[PDB]
Amino acid sequence: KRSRKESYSVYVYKVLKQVHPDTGISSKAMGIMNSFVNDIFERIAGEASRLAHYNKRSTITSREIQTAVRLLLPGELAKHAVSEGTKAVTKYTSA
Template identity: 60%
Template sequence: MSDKRQVVAGLEIDGMFEKLVGEAAKLARYNKKPTITSREIQTSVRLVLLGELAKHAVSEGAKAVTKFTSS
């Protein structure tokens, strides 16, 4: 992958992360919670990504959290 393509891919990932965090923050404010929990993150993933991509992302995220907490 060329350097320019890597930069573009990095910017797209950053943009997606900002969308997810922004949506999670809105959900936390709506529910009057002072912090963002895994529930807000999962809901924001489902709202932003949609369909099979959202299901896969939630599944992989849950596996990562389980692996992290069990080690």
């Protein structure tokens, strides 16, 4: 065997099985999705680091990413993202 090259494989297939049970996935489209998740995670993490340095904060919690989503993602997607992220953090607090 070889070393594991970590990816977002099973996650993209299960979210597709949630949203469209019948359609299939190509390897090229899956690579596109991997690079998309890499890009968006990199953008949000970098801007979270920027707000950490900017407010002289060593701490990055959901509030700074809510700040960053309000920064980067425009408008409709921003408030949508804040909505399901708030639901997610509330179910996290309720475990």
